[PDB]
Write a protein that binds this ligand. Sequence first.
Ligand SMILES: O=C(Nc1nncn1C1CC1)[C@@H]1CCOc2ccccc21
Ligand SMILES: O=C(Nc1nncn1C1CC1)[C@@H]1CCOc2ccccc21
Lengths: 304, 304
Amino acid sequence: SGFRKMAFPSGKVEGCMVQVTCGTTTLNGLWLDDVVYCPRHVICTSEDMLNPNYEDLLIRKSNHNFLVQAGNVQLRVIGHSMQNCVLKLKVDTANPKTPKYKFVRIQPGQTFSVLACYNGSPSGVYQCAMRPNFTIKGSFLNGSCGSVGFNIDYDCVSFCYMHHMELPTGVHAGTDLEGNFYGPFVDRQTAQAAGTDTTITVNVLAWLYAAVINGDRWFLNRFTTTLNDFNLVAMKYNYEPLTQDHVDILGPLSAQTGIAVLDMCASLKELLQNGMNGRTILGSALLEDEFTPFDVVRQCSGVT
Amino acid sequence: SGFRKMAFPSGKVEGCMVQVTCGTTTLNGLWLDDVVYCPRHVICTSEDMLNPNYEDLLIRKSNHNFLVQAGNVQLRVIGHSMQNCVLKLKVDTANPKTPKYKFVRIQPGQTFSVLACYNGSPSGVYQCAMRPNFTIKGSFLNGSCGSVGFNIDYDCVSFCYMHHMELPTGVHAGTDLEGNFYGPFVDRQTAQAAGTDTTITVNVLAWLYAAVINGDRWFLNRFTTTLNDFNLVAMKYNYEPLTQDHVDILGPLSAQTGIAVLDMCASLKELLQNGMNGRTILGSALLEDEFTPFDVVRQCSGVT
Ligand SMILES: O=C(Nc1nncn1C1CC1)[C@@H]1CCOc2ccccc21
Ligand SMILES: O=C(Nc1nncn1C1CC1)[C@@H]1CCOc2ccccc21
């Protein structure tokens, strides 16, 4: 037993990280097959970032201007193109360590692991969630751009995020592996404020089920509620509305614990209205929302 | 910016995980060079666990009784020995993926990454701290024994923990890689209760410095304190006493932020006495103690 904020094993993704340098700018690239993917802002000077015309800035770059280093060896760039906000650098060597992979665009509320990298080298791995305002709360310093977010289904890595930037509020923004930003963010040094960071209700409920499975049961009460009544309280507390689709997704956890989804909603409603009173749930003093129902089942069943 | 509970990249350790089976029992082993290390309780039936005589149970086991599988290939066991609570299985093939490594015994308060495994296969990675009562609060189900804890210094993995058991309270116990348990725990299905789980003061202070570096400054106050005054409050709150050695260790973080260590102690003293008042620090509603001062510097500087 025990329940931790767990990231996927990062080995398969470490095998893909390379360093990409264009002029004075060094960031990370993701090498899969014979393509290296990286944020297109690698072509910018800090001055260009204020109002960059990427097509125009790219005209001044040739294949030999993109320096790609995998470990201590240089890769030969034989082609380059821009797809949305990412560059795809075609190299002459397929990555021998390329795992089975997919490029997926995730929905808000979905979690993933980030392998934070600097100069093509992994520094650490942590678990993130795509927030309902399409930001992530990561740990990214200068040089971390191009680090990726992913999930793993046994031996297939599904890449869902590439890090591009930090907003003035300290929250993070990035793209899927097709270069499309999550949310309304743009790769420009301009005023960009994030919307409301609501709490991912279905994930909190999943985590309350993990707490029950792992023996923390003090918050269970004698009440029930309805989706409509629960959502009135969820609205007041800046929680995402709970839908019948979320109820269906929590079905397996409801079955495992014998606690009906709406009874768990009533427990959550009381926790919102009354607070924790100085108590903790799975070592947390706040309601955790960065575990999906699938993450809870995965961790509680020991999937590899 | 941003500060996350980050684990080390796990690739180097994934390359070492194997499955070990003895009779009906399957757990994990750590394959380094031509030796596979695993918990000695792999030789026990659930019945033997109540009062096992490991030397006697081991007499009934031969090299061919230890089935070691690395991926989908079987390893040949050419020797076996017991060192404290671990078995060392000599195999005929050195692990080709053996990283540079050390075996270290850590002190309470030190953190490490755990690569949770089942049947020699990695399921996830998370960050732990050796608690002051020599337990860890992990996420370990049946089959996870033999999963290891480690730290990495660039390319050298220092293995510090091997998982052996779960106490009736749901907390975890294990050994260093020489097979010596942390704390007073024994590998026997008997009443073993953990002592007081005090809070690792030096780690909380390090995390308050990370909060200041990452822009969360509301808790900074106009006060200072002394080590003796602070420790009177630390004692009342079940916090570890702060020593001049801890003050020295926090020196670099004090320098980076310009906040004297004793002023940060005074901020912590007020947080203990007054609570958070519904506010958060780095997204937490409790004072986090599973980041060492070295972890804070490492993460805030982007070490790879
Ligand atoms: O935010 C950036 N880098 C970054 N992403 N996460 C952390 N970091 C560094 C800690 C800042 C850079 C800085 C200059 O302005 C822009 C504009 C657009 C895209 C990227 C950037
Ligand atoms: O605790 C154990 N296994 C375990 N370690 N973490 C999680 N788990 C399983 C979730 C229980 C086993 C169970 C039988 O009794 C003993 C006695 C000594 C050593 C190991 C064990």
